[PDB]
Amino acid sequence: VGTAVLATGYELFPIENKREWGYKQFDNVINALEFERLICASGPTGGHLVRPSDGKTPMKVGFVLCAGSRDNTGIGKPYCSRFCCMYSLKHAHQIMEKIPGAVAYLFYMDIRSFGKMYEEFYYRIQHEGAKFIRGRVANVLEDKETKNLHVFTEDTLLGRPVDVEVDLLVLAAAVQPNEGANELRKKFGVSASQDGWMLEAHPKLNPCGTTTAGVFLAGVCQGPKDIPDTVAQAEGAASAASIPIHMGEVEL
Amino acid sequence: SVPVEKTAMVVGGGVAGMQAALDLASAGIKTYLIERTPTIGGRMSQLDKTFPTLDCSQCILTPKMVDVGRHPNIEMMTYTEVEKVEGYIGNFDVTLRKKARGVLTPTEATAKGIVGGGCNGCGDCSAVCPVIKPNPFEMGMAPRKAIYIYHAQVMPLIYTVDFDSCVKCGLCVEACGDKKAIDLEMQDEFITVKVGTAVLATGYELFPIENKREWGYKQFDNVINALEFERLICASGPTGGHLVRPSDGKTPMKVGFVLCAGSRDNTGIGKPYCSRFCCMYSLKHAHQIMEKIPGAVAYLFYMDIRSFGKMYEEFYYRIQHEGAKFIRGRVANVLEDKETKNLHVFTEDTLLGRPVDVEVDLLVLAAAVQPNEGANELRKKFGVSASQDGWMLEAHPKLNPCGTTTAGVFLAGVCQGPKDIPDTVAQAEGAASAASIPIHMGEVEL
Amino acid sequence: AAKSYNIPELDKKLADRRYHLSDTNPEFTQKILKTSRTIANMCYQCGTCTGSCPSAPRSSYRIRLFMRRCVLGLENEALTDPDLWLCTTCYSCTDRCPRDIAPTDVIMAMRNLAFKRDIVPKNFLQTVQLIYNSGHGVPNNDVNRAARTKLGLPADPPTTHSYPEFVKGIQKIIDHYELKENADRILKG
Amino acid sequence: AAKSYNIPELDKKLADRRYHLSDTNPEFTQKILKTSRTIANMCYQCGTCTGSCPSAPRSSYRIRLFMRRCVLGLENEALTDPDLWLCTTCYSCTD
Amino acid sequence: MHEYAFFLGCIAPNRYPGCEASAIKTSEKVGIKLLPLKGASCCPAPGAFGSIDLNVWYAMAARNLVLAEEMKKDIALICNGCYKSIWEVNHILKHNDELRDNVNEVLAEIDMQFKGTIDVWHLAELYYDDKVCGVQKIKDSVTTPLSGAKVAAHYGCHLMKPKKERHFGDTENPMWFEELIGALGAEPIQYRNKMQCCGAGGGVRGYDIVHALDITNEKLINIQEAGADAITELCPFCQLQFDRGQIEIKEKFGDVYNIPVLHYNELLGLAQGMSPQDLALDLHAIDCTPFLQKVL
Numbered sequence A: 001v002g003t004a005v006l007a008t009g010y011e012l013f014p015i016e017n018k019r020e021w022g023y024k025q026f027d028n029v030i031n032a033l034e035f036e037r038l039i040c041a042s043g044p045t046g047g048h049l050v051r052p053s054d055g056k057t058p059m060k061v062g063f064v065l066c067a068g069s070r071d072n073t074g075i076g077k078p079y080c081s082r083f084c085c086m087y088s089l090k091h092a093h094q095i096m097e098k099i100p101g102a103v104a105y106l107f108y109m110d111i112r113s114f115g116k117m118y119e120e121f122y123y124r125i126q127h128e129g130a131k132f133i134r135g136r137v138a139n140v141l142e143d144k145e146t147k148n149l150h151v152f153t154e155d156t157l158l159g160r161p162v163d164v165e166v167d168l169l170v171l172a173a174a175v176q177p178n179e180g181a182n183e184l185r186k187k188f189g190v191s192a193s194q195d196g197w198m199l200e201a202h203p204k205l206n207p208c209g210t211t212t213a214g215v216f217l218a219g220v221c222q223g224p225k226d227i228p229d230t231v232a233q234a235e236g237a238a239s240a241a242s243i244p245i246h247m248g249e250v251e252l
Numbered sequence B: 001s002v003p004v005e006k007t008a009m010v011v012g013g014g015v016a017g018m019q020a021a022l023d024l025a026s027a028g029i030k031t032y033l034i035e036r037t038p039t040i041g042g043r044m045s046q047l048d049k050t051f052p053t054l055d056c057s058q059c060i061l062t063p064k065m066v067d068v069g070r071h072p073n074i075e076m077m078t079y080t081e082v083e084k085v086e087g088y089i090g091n092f093d094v095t096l097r098k099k100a101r102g103v104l105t106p107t108e109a110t111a112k113g114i115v116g117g118g119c120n121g122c123g124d125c126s127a128v129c130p131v132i133k134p135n136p137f138e139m140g141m142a143p144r145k146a147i148y149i150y151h152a153q154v155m156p157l158i159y160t161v162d163f164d165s166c167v168k169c170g171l172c173v174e175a176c177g178d179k180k181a182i183d184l185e186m187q188d189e190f191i192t193v194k195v196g197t198a199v200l201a202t203g204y205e206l207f208p209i210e211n212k213r214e215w216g217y218k219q220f221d222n223v224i225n226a227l228e229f230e231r232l233i234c235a236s237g238p239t240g241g242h243l244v245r246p247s248d249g250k251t252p253m254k255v256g257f258v259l260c261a262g263s264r265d266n267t268g269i270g271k272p273y274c275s276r277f278c279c280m281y282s283l284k285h286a287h288q289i290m291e292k293i294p295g296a297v298a299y300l301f302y303m304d305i306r307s308f309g310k311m312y313e314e315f316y317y318r319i320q321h322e323g324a325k326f327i328r329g330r331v332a333n334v335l336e337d338k339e340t341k342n343l344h345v346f347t348e349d350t351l352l353g354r355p356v357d358v359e360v361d362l363l364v365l366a367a368a369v370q371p372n373e374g375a376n377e378l379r380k381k382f383g384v385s386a387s388q389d390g391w392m393l394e395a396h397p398k399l400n401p402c403g404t405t406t407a408g409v410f411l412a413g414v415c416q417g418p419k420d421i422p423d424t425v426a427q428a429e430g431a432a433s434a435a436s437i438p439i440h441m442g443e444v445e446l
Numbered sequence C: 001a002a003k004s005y006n007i008p009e010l011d012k013k014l015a016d017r018r019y020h021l022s023d024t025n026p027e028f029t030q031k032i033l034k035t036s037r038t039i040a041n042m043c044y045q046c047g048t049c050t051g052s053c054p055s056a057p058r059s060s061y062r063i064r065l066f067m068r069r070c071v072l073g074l075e076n077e078a079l080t081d082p083d084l085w086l087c088t089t090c091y092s093c094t095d096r097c098p099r100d101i102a103p104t105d106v107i108m109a110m111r112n113l114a115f116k117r118d119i120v121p122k123n124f125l126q127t128v129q130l131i132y133n134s135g136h137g138v139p140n141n142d143v144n145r146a147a148r149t150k151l152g153l154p155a156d157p158p159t160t161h162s163y164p165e166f167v168k169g170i171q172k173i174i175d176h177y178e179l180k181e182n183a184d185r186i187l188k189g
Numbered sequence D: 001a002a003k004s005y006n007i008p009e010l011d012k013k014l015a016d017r018r019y020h021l022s023d024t025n026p027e028f029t030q031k032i033l034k035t036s037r038t039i040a041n042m043c044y045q046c047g048t049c050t051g052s053c054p055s056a057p058r059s060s061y062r063i064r065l066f067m068r069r070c071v072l073g074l075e076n077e078a079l080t081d082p083d084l085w086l087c088t089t090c091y092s093c094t095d
Numbered sequence E: 001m002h003e004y005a006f007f008l009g010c011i012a013p014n015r016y017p018g019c020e021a022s023a024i025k026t027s028e029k030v031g032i033k034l035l036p037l038k039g040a041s042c043c044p045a046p047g048a049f050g051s052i053d054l055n056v057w058y059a060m061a062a063r064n065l066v067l068a069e070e071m072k073k074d075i076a077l078i079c080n081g082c083y084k085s086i087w088e089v090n091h092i093l094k095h096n097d098e099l100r101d102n103v104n105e106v107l108a109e110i111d112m113q114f115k116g117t118i119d120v121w122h123l124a125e126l127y128y129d130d131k132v133c134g135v136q137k138i139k140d141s142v143t144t145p146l147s148g149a150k151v152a153a154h155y156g157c158h159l160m161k162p163k164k165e166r167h168f169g170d171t172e173n174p175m176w177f178e179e180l181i182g183a184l185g186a187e188p189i190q191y192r193n194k195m196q197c198c199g200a201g202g203g204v205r206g207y208d209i210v211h212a213l214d215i216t217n218e219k220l221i222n223i224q225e226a227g228a229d230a231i232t233e234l235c236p237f238c239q240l241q242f243d244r245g246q247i248e249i250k251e252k253f254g255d256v257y258n259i260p261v262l263h264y265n266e267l268l269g270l271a272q273g274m275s276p277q278d279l280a281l282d283l284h285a286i287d288c289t290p291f292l293q294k295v296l
Ligand SMILES: Cc1cc2nc3c(=O)[nH]c(=O)nc-3n(C[C@H](O)[C@H](O)[C@H](O)COP(=O)(O)OP(=O)(O)OC[C@H]3O[C@@H](n4cnc5c(N)ncnc54)[C@H](O)[C@@H]3O)c2cc1C
Pocket: B011, B012, B013, B014, B015, B016, B017, B034, B035, B036, B037, B039, B040, B041, B042, B043, B044, B047, B049, B050, B051, B052, B080, B081, B082, B201, B202, B203, B204, B205, B226, B227, B230, B277, B281, B284, B372, B374, B375, B378, B412, B413, B414, B415, B419, B420, B421, B422, B424
């Protein structure tokens, strides 16, 4: 080959750590990708969000934002995952639309709707009835009789402790590079960044390039992004890779 | 079905337009780079440093700017505007207005018939001009002559002249004698070019914050906006990089930053959207004041600090570590003391739940961004629709962020919506690739 | 906050401070929306309203907390709050809110609901008495009758005072809303 | 909150509730940092600490408010607060 | 020659009749005809009455409006609170269908209906406007120069706020009422936070009087620091609070203020040659004698 483009993507951070959220030990605690599969019409059920504990439809769903993110404790990630605020809003809309009378609670700590038409989406989600409690979740308990989830945090606005009862709890987990991505980027002589993503030739004026010549980066493997930003990055990488191929020579 | 001319046009010489033109030229396509201003640099040329790496903006941009000028596949038409566009993706007949530059380049001087070159950039003409006008690059804060350049590091250094302010005394003519670069009686030129594809990179301007009277931007003298602060803090700005109060010239020990100024507003005066980078350059400004002025303290009156990108949250951590105070409350209103023009900022600190009145020596408003003036007219010239937010509309919001519904026209940069510099450059490269596809194939079907 | 003890001092000292989802009744919040005629649920707690308030710097009144209580439907907390009658209705918060909310109209609706639960300062009831009797919350007296005579003015202005026949009509309006009966039965000693 | 009146009941009832920049003394905050051996200035008020507290549900004690007072250097407000001795030092917030 | 019904609420006729008399005569000598309403009542005071029930507020304000409606004239006002009540209810009932239907079915018990044919103006609104008497016509109607007096203007709240419900422009540094004082020859002064509420609204002046006085005393501190010889008002609520509050601030606290406060119409009368006697200055709690000696 003449040039190479790396688009290895991402996986979910293991939220089985950070024990105070019972992802693996409580049955009605799930992650965002599991939620997407459960609410899609092509998923294990007919698109009907049901509780894994007993298969009954939930009426009360909590969303834990920043789950394992902006975390300096060494367990989670110290960076922001960029899209977890937006797809949490999307999930809240989907549950409030598909299940009539269901209420979505979003335990948030800096709602981040920065992109085009994102603030309007946030406005629409609030208008449709989603509840926003500004507080990072402290911990999660579960009732032994009914496998419902007690979510303990503080509403820092209103300044009061809060214990919210939910039938389902969804963790907006952080994103990390796919397994085996570091071995691949070593195989191409590409250095990692201090977050662990692939490093760029220049953080400002060459987001697609790399110090090693003829290798270009595209997508979340360079850092978490939305689909439109990912596509723009991919097209830029394709153009940068095509330039030497089109010219046919690299001038030393 | 229809042939494609092996030429491309990029409107806007900003970082997006420069990157698109360089990419198209490197692919081998002859490209026109059309710039309204006498220089190409754009908004990135006005910034002092860049979040989050704190690199100097001009130093990174200068190599890219030098390349556009030298590149043989790019014709860089600065100080020109698009009068009319007709045709379709096959052939686009675009007629351009070469505004009266007033000064000839050596190529133009040779074409005229005089062996004397035009404007080596000596700057002797600006030393004798008696007219003093505001400088748009510093945008009203520094003096400039009738014949001028925006700054020292301008790509085409040809010393344009503003004929609306020139009194035609002819002193610069004698200052430039034996080169004959200055022709005071020249006028606009109408040129027609044929291009296969067009890339729109018109960029952005600042939202007019003379409105929102509760922040006395044009009322109180020590209330400024973000770009004014960038020009004041840069070492090449109106002063020697020393942030001073406009009221009396003294060094401020205390400055506030009003985030979301005119942003996320549904009142019909401001903008209902997020400008996507106000938080980060506010953090950068806080870092710069704390580093440059010893003992000065930054107060950021914020609401949802938004550091979402690569190394953005760590920048936020560093800024908080350096001692920046974060009051989570939208500024309610601003008063000033008549005696010492200090600014009283009244809001709530919603965390801690208490009303707050903060003295500041200086107040900086992180104003929302808007499409530039005349961008709607150009957008209509190419048959591009607008978004609900007023930005140029893309073909598909997800899988085609650069293309438009009209064929052969592609978007790049903040003209499609507010973005950071790396996102802008990625969009520019993508648009260049999308424009190169039909030219490389040399034929499209409609 | 372990459980109810039936010792009033200890029940007050160990009151449960945790918000529970049983603490929310929607009925309160859409009564507020259907009376105040404002988009109250759209508040995102920017704090501009409290930062505008002339009552906030000198008391515990926080209009933003009232907006939060309305959104979360916390009746028995907003209505039974003595800092509900400290709002001067200066409309500064409404003038500055970035969401086009009128928080003072939410305050007015809350005051209406509080009146429908016998929670109301006695000055309002006294003003009701005055308007029912004479049609004037601030009525005329003999000294100003003398002053008006000395001004060349008629002793009584051209109002329901000069024309008592209209007063009965005004009374009917109050009588339609049972306002006189409530004011009477709350003004009892 | 207009000004001092020298009527103690009215001075208590009309206490100025507005935070001013004269209300902050740094000396308090770096005594706190040099005694507690923790990065207290780095709090961004997520509320996890208060949501963890066993004292918060049954009193007015809010550890997050104390952290905010430390960051803003509000001595005479944190020290003279009776809900400073309700902390059981269970270390859940730290955890 | 323009003619208006004169609503004349409670405080102006019942404690400060000089404001009423000056309004009629001063508006008469300039080209306006203020003439009485047929049995107008308390406009349901927006604070003291709108807090407990909004429907009775609507009904009473609508009855006041339809008195002038059956009178076939549009209303002129001299009170910001009366403006709030009358003008706001008139604006609301002209657009909301079901509220107007409820108001009409309540009013049917007294055989009298609302349809929304008239408009409501503040007398200051008319004194500025160009088609009605402008500022130049007022300046011409001034006989005594009334100069050499530092006058502080208090706009109040219910006249101009909120922007989205009013039409007077910026509510944050207005200058129009300042021009009204300037036409009289008195120099208007600027003081910090001049748009602050006086504290008497919303029934607060009745509910917890000390809180309302603290808001008034902050304003009075700023006004004295500016150096005002008098305060000018477009609201008898603000008149009452400033004058009697000065009396109660002297009593409750230990703050001495001898600043007279006048409605704008007494200033217009003094500028147009009216004596203090027929303006009833002696019914003000705070003596106006220093101001009169300064200007006369
Ligand atoms: C105060 C401030 C601070 C910032 N700080 C940072 C930072 O630290 N780091 C960072 O990464 N980003 C920063 N940004 C963002 C950065 O400025 C933008 O991402 C970038 O400028 C976008 O480039 P652009 O070429 O699309 O815009 P522009 O530079 O505005 O491009 C537009 C160009 O085209 C020209 N043009 C416009 N209309 C026409 C027309 N009709 N015909 C011809 N020419 C035309 C204009 O004259 C201009 O040269 C900051 C922005 C602001 C406002």
